[PDB]
């Protein structure tokens, strides 16, 4: 087979050549296309992109915090991972009109929705225990008890909650599906920062599928990535033109280091990325 | 060449017949299934109503107008001559899900409810929901009118809080609009596709919805992109589909809107005309209740 990384590089090239120029909320400007699809195998490989060093600590800390149910950027920041920080700052918060919120309180984003869909948000500090729908645990429970079920969904798109989010979910909705003894996942990504977010988001969902496969006794299958609004910010064009000239090296493997029973017990130290040989880091700026 | 138009649907069928996995399902029918497919249907001077069989267009049109009104009552649809929801609202079905105290035809907070009242507290199918919840459809329209650059133009029917009250959770789960070159496109995330019966309706339906929104926003329809999660043929569809896969698609019909409409709720059935529709004969297929 060809390297799966070529799909992503394919997507980049496609946007650079035929994407429309639009204005955007962030002021940066973008090139954008609508409606793309890639399929990354998870069978004895893991799609951490190799044409640039991806911040793997970032992906892994990020997801654990999602699982944790946290909406507090500083709880992520404590770990070495400054990715959510700008969306959670005094400045940004004030520019959305959220003058009462504390520094780092992103609103009812991913963690809250994955774990407590439907609950009344208050602040990142509240104890939301027992409240809302625990979509994640229900996914796991469905995979174990009725793997043939056609409703195995986790949705972060909460239209009621939209007005309180520092930012509405880019990765809006996933579906898992079991065939033979393999667990697959399809992500519907309504909005894809192709330069910065998407490398993270791909690894993020591949890693989630690995975790759920581990605790359900399934083997991981495919991660299918459906994009809606896929954009390159203009300050990413030159950076990605550098990236486009690199040859993918073989994807690494993800190793899980102990039998873990419940999604909540996973710790950063339970994972090891083996045989990851990326090209150098390419600094790209985050559009705020 | 890679397939285009109806050929995508036909090839989707062939792939499930030759490739899908045999599973038992909630209906007891059995299915063949496959996970994660995609098709792109042009809406430019063509309307994707399948020609390899006669699709019940009035069904499609009457089902979408019912969605838009925000009805959750099978009988309001049934009374228009369109029976496709009756089985999912019958006494027996409702009871089998434990809804004994609920009136026949009360589907719960399904599609129409979520589009125009997302997050409101569902009472019964009879309640006035005038001005409660999030009106997603109206929000779609207005953001298209005023900020086409917005990468958050989304109508989502998937409501985890409301699932336990639904006759059936949404098969067409979420949709997103996109605007380029004064053209309106729409991607649909269909978590569950009944490939022989519902999927022909769904395509026609999203394409319909896109024509109406294009029409009220001063845009021209572009593309309908169809993303399938779980895609499945019911076993007792297999022989009927074998007739269908024998036939050559004919060119798609055109859809004409008959008058200048300003508001979404203003559309009536009389406003649409399908022109040059030329299907091979209806192929009947039993529904999986
Ligand atoms: N513009 C934008 N904002 C967003 C997202 C996004 O994808 N794009 N997100 C949705 O995903 C969240 C943030 N995700 C992010 C993922 C990676 C990086 C980033 O700066 N990547 C660098 C830095 C790595 C490091 O910190 O050492 C890199 O990989 O080069 C930033 C945000 C919320 N806000
Ligand atoms: N099994 C099943 N249940 C479902 C759906 C579905 O697609 N399949 N739906 C999600 O979409 C909803 C109803 N949609 C339907 C659309 C068409 C037909 C059907 O029987 N089609 C016949 C109609 C013929 C006629 O009425 O004249 C046909 O097209 O031959 C049934 C349900 C609710 N539950
Ligand atoms: Cl609650
Ligand atoms: Cl480096
Ligand atoms: Cl012919």
Residue numbers in the entry:
A (entry chain A): 26 to 313
B (entry chain B): 25 to 313
What does the report in the manuscript say about this coordinate set?
The hTS variant Q62R, having the interface residue Gln62 replaced by arginine, was generated and characterized through kinetic assay, circular dichroism (CD) thermal denaturation analysis and X-ray crystallography. The structure of HT-hTS Q62R was solved to 2.55 Å resolution, showing that the mutated protein retains the constitutive dimeric quaternary structure of the wild-type enzyme. Four enzyme homodimers (A–B, C–D, E–F, G–H, in our model) were found in the cell asymmetric unit (ASU), all fully traced apart for the first twenty-five N-terminal residues (further the twelve residues belonging to the non-removable His6-tag). From the initial phases of structure solution and refinement, it was evident that HT-hTS Q62R was in the active conformation. Nonetheless, the analysis of the electron density in the active site area evidenced that the catalytic Cys195 was modified as S,S-(2-hydroxyethyl)thiocysteine (CME195) by the reaction with β-mercaptoethanol, added to the protein sample prior to the crystallization experiments. In all subunits, a sulfate anion was observed nearby the catalytic cysteine, anchored to the guanidinium moieties of the four arginine residues Arg50, Arg215, Arg175′, and Arg176’ (the last two from the partner subunit). Furthermore, in all active sites, the presence of a folate-like molecule was systematically observed. The active conformation adopted in the crystal by HT-hTS Q62R can be ascribed to the population of the cofactor site by 5-FTHF (the formation of the analogous complex in the wild-type enzyme has never been reported). However, the comparison of the mutant crystal structure with that of the wild-type enzyme in the active conformation suggests a likely explanation for the observed HT-hTS Q62R destabilization occurring in solution. The superimposition, displayed in Figure 6, provides clear evidence that the point-mutation Q62R induces a slight aperture of the enzyme dimer which is particularly visible in the area surrounding Arg62 and Arg62′ on the two enzyme halves.
